Design a protein around this ligand. Sequence first.
Ligand SMILES: CN(C)c1ncc(Cl)c(Nc2ccc3c(c2)CC(=O)N3)n1
Ligand SMILES: CN(C)c1ncc(Cl)c(Nc2ccc3c(c2)CC(=O)N3)n1
Ligand SMILES: [Cl-]
Ligand SMILES: [Cl-]
Lengths: 123, 123, 4, 4
Amino acid sequence: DSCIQFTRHASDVLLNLNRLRSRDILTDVVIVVSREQFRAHKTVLMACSGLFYSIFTDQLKCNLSVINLDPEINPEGFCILLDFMYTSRLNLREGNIMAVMATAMYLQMEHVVDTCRKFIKAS
Amino acid sequence: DSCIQFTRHASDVLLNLNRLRSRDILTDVVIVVSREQFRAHKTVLMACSGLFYSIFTDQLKCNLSVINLDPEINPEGFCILLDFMYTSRLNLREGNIMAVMATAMYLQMEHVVDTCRKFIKAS
Amino acid sequence: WVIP
Amino acid sequence: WVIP
Ligand SMILES: CN(C)c1ncc(Cl)c(Nc2ccc3c(c2)CC(=O)N3)n1
Ligand SMILES: CN(C)c1ncc(Cl)c(Nc2ccc3c(c2)CC(=O)N3)n1
Ligand SMILES: [Cl-]
Ligand SMILES: [Cl-]
């Protein structure tokens, strides 16, 4: 086509979606990880995770307001990944990298799994 | 912070949100423009437009599944802008620039209004 | 704005 | 991935 493109549009959209999350506006699901609860937008979860994409395209699970993750999933690893989904920023540290990689493999977030494998290989 | 960043994350998120729109997955509103109907995600509309942000943060309008725009709004101008919201790409042409600018002013999409003003000033 |  |  003969379209023009606004370079910062996608980043600005994601910034506003994170502002809506922080104010709990139009969140439509709660992700339960052990004792911890995380509110989010199903569309953003699907856009970032192969696991959530599969869950919310299912004709029965698409209507659930609560999703319980596998009890092996660490709440901190999930929190770091949820923050990454809404910001593009990953808080990867020596003390959390194993929990982050395991959570990213479960959530099917290929690019996060790739950077965790590379950072572990370096050490 | 000490975060790392994935450059393509925001663009990849927006690409997936457009894939969901194209398949009519988790769309939660229909925007009526004269005789024409457009399905979309309220969160994406809010993230891109000052008008939709105001509408869906309203305690009564947040629950509406149908929004009717002002009858002066041109369906083609709206379609071009909805496509821009989900792609960052604007199909700006000599034959549609006046309708696109008027629709962007109504929708409160400041960056689109700015490029339309500049393209009109050049001609 | 750019030419993509 | 980059240092933002
Ligand atoms: C694959 N596909 C057509 C598609 N359409 C829409 C959405 Cl929201 C979607 N999201 C999704 C699927 C798989 C994966 C991801 C997002 C991230 C990832 O590493 N794997 N994937
Ligand atoms: C202004 N604010 C705190 C905010 N938070 C969340 C959202 Cl979704 C939002 N969106 C929005 C508001 C105004 C405008 C836009 C989006 C685009 C524009 O040109 N004006 N604006
Ligand atoms: Cl990823
Ligand atoms: Cl804009």
